[PDB]
Point group: C2
Chain length 265, copies 2
């Protein structure tokens, strides 16, 4: 382209895723460780470181491983618130590194814170280681951161790259622118892315514113078994895632594969 893956890758992827887852956881972161658941796986590785941162927171870681080787880184893513616121822131721114580228711112710131430390650680580780590778991874935111871281690482340069580194892532867312893416691619690194398935874251942121893415892727688718696817390419695419848418867831997210891523568981 596418492719597927393978297984491985797935595983790787897963691882890464786881780581892423783981881271877231715391333990690881932171714591770281490983522980847881897964861781183981891772553981091983180581860681190282871781971171967281413060412101943103961121977381892451790284670781490483080785075984593986590787390183790783991671881251985571877211948881817281712161882261868421851152895421837321874216615105873117630128880235820175490159130139152109851118891225967214927161893432870146976251890464830155962481880155540196881481890177450183890584580187350281790587350185140480270197080888290783690285890877880164883671996741979201973680993835874104891781991627850124890777780138840173790559850148830185250191070494690383591609290869190693890687890345992964897962878921894632885217871151830135394219360119850145491218650158891343370139760087390469690897890456992967893853895413888861548905996920848512890746887618875121847216692219348219611117944114874218880158890476690769892966895616896954478924778981078982697982498946894844891847595519491849890187860047972114459519295929794967874217395618478915718318538807877417857240848961797926967281886781891845298974594992858861874021938381841891």
């Amino acid at each position: 382209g596418i492719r597927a893956a393978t297984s491985q890758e797935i595983n790787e992827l897963t691882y890464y895723t786881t780581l892423s887852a783981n881271s877231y956881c715391r333990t690881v972161i932171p714591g770281a460780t490983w522980d847881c658941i897964h861781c183981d796986a891772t553981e091983d590785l180581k860681i190282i470181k871781t971171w967281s941162t413060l412101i943103y927171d961121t977381n892451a870681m790284v670781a490483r491983g080785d075984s593986e080787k590787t390183i790783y880184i991671v881251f985571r893513g877211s948881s817281s618130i712161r882261n868421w616121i851152a895421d837321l822131t874216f615105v873117p721114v630128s880235y820175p590194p490159v130139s152109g580228t851118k891225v967214h711112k927161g893432f870146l710131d976251s890464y830155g814170e962481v880155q540196n430390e881481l890177v450183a650680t890584v580187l350281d580780q790587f350185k140480q280681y270197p080888s290783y590778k690285v890877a880164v991874t883671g996741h979201s935111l973680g993835g874104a951161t891781a991627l850124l871281c890777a780138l840173d690482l790559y850148q830185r340069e250191e070494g690383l790259s591609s290869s190693n580194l890687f890345l992964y892532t897962q878921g894632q867312p885217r871151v830135g622118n394219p360119a850145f893416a491218n650158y891343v691619v370139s760087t390469g690194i690897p890456y992967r892315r893853t895413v888861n398935e548905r996920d848512i874251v890746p887618h875121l942121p847216p692219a348219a514113f611117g944114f874218l893415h880158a890476g690769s892727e892966y895616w896954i688718t478924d778981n078982s078994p697982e498946t894844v696817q891847v595519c491849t390419s890187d860047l972114e695419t459519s295929d794967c895632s874217n395618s478915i848418v718318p538807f877417t867831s857240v848961l797926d997210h967281l886781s891845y594969f298974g594992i858861n891523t874021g938381l841891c568981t």
Copy 2:
């Protein structure tokens, strides 16, 4: 345109857522018762128835318440696978018723288965118652368915428507284409758617393829416290868621415010 828411528405837315957551748861568905956681718241218422368916498954438831018166328805968403596948488926276718337208386818287927128975138952228741118223618511896927348923228732114629128725738813895725857415626116128824923151688923588926858516837315953114834113326118746118894317886541999704948604826791 844117524115823122117031517180018441837231518461118512828451318631528805728771228812858705628751548904887823188972126890318631288925178982238914218421138981758871938341438921318580628712428881018261018554438831018646528831448814678941087978194939696708678807678932748813328715328731118523018274016291318140118222118635318621528821648805748831996824868881398963188936638803897833448905867712896936877418493619667318155509638606147927118317012519042208367408748506896617698955848712438607778833528612257718448841538607117738538822428506128847428612127617128856318413127748128885117548017065018462128714418412438706748821967631996702648931827411777618528731737416467718418412437418258926427215256608147927128876018475228823726017017034018463318512638706618511948551996350858612877318468914367818544118035319358816436218137618648814135319128717017226118421528605518411728611867514948551880132979410893824718503865215887915894517637219481119075609787717767318428607318713218213618511857314837531933151938681714391828671815141838512628414834117317113118805348808778808860118512112618221778418723116952131891418880133885215798934987681856221698942838851718503716181618661967781897816698962338951």
